[PDB]
């Protein structure tokens, strides 16, 4: 499965090894993200709480609480100062990380808010809901700027591209959708011949590629500009849950994903080969994240497991 990097690294395979296990959530873990400054890891969970731990030592930092029901997603401001969380209480919350204080509640969705990100400028927040819409919010006012009639089933994931000019969305209706932030227009619908529910989507770090997970045990690399699926990733288990997935780019080029067999899967991006399967979880691995500068994976498992795990690699 070796990958070609530079001279004398013709055969790079990653070697992630579990370093820390992070414990405290009293229910299913839902989302874990590294802060852009790589100093912190935020997690959300069905226990209604968001926790902050050290990205390198995994030591517990704090509890941020306020949501009246469970939490499906969490996202950092571009300066690592603010959090946005998405909840079963139909709202999102904006948090100052230093004080742990709720800055804004974002009210307007009529159902569970499943997913959230800030744009790179971090003046804007996108969210997907069980209400079947995608919403665009002003970070500094709480105003819903736009409601997009995005899909015809709950909205699984949303994300902003490199300059924040586009939003990618996915849903259970079998659709990945690209919207113009400025205009609220649908610019692309991406779909292959089959139409399985779309459990996840994210733009690659340079905006040129999209990574979609579908509930037929598959991840796909799409070229956005062309509507062309380019690479497919299989071998793992994804038929029920909306698992987070990732480009790993600090080392070799990998695709990292949780799987429903309790493993973290990692693949050669180029050749699609499975290069590593990571053990330690005892329930479905629902979320994974990749550290901004170190070869560090954060994993998080479901209700029978309740733990976050941090693995470390040399590439």
Swiss-Prot record:
This is WD repeat-containing protein 5. Changing residue 303 to A: Strongly reduced affinity for histone H3. No effect on interaction with KMT2A. It comes from Homo sapiens. PROSITE patterns: WD_REPEATS_1 (PS00678), WD_REPEATS_2 (PS50082), WD_REPEATS_REGION (PS50294). Keywords: Acetylation, Chromatin regulator, Host-virus interaction, Isopeptide bond, Nucleus, Repeat, Transcription, Transcription regulation, Ubl conjugation, WD repeat. There is a cross-link at residue 27 (Glycyl lysine isopeptide (Lys-Gly) (interchain with G-Cter in SUMO2)). The record marks 88, 114, 244, 303 as: Important for interaction with histone H3. One of its GO terms (molecular function) is histone H3K4 methyltransferase activity. Belongs to the WD repeat WDR5/wds family. Interacts with PAXBP1; the interaction is direct and links a WDR5-containing histone methyltransferase complex to PAX7 and PAX3. Interacts with HCFC1. Component of the ATAC complex, a complex with histone acetyltransferase activity on histones H3 and H4. Component of the SET1 complex, at least composed of the catalytic subunit (SETD1A or SETD1B), WDR5, WDR82, RBBP5, ASH2L/ASH2, CXXC1/CFP1, HCFC1 and DPY30. Core component of several methyltransferase-containing complexes including MLL1/MLL, MLL2/3 (also named ASCOM complex) and MLL4/WBP7. (Microbial infection) Interacts with herpes virus 8/HHV-8 protein LANA1; this interaction regulates the MLL1 histone methyltransferase activity on viral DNA. It is found in: Nucleus. Its main location: nucleus. It holds the Pfam family Beta-prop_WDR5. Changing residue 72 to F: Strongly reduced affinity for histone H3. One of its GO terms (biological process) is negative regulation of transcription by RNA polymerase II.
């Amino acid at each position: 499965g070796g990958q070609q990097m530079g001279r004398g690294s013709e055969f790079v395979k990653p070697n992630y090894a579990l370093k820390f296990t992070l414990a405290g959530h009293t229910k299913a873990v839902s989302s874990v993200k590294f802060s852009p400054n790589g100093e912190w890891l935020a997690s959300s969970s069905a226990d209604k709480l968001i926790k902050i731990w050290g990205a390198y030592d995994g030591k517990f930092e704090k509890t941020i609480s306020g949501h009246k029901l469970g939490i499906s997603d969490v996202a950092w401001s571009s300066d690592s100062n603010l959090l946005v969380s998405a909840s079963d209480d139909k709202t999102l919350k904006i948090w100052d990380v230093s004080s742990g204080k709720c800055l804004k509640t974002l009210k307007g969705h009529s159902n569970y808010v499943f997913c959230c990100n800030f744009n790179p400028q971090s003046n804007l927040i996108v969210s997907g809901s069980f209400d079947e819409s995608v919403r665009i919010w002003d970070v500094k006012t709480g105003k819903c700027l736009k409601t997009l009639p995005a899909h015809s089933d709950p909205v699984s994931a949303v994300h902003f591209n490199r300059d924040g000019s586009l939003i990618v969305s996915s849903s259970y209706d079998g659709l990945c959708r690209i919207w113009d932030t400025a205009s609220g227009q649908c610019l692309k619908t991406l779909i292959d011949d089959d139409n399985p529910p779309v459990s996840f989507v994210k733009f690659s770090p340079n905006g040129k590629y999209i990574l979609a997970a579908t509930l037929d045990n598959t991840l796909k690399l799409w070229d956005y500009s062309k509507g062309k699926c380019l690479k497919t990733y299989t071998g793992h288990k994804n038929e029920k849950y909306c698992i987070f997935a990732n480009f790993s780019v600090t080392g070799g080029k990998w695709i990292v994903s949780g799987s429903e067999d309790n493993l973290v899967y990692i693949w050669n991006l180029q050749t699609k080969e499975i290069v590593q399967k990571l053990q330690g979880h005892t329930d479905v691995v629902i979320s994974t994240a990749c550290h901004p500068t170190e070869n560090i994976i954060a994993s998080a498992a479901l209700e029978n497991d309740k733990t976050i795990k941090l693995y470390k690699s040399d590439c």
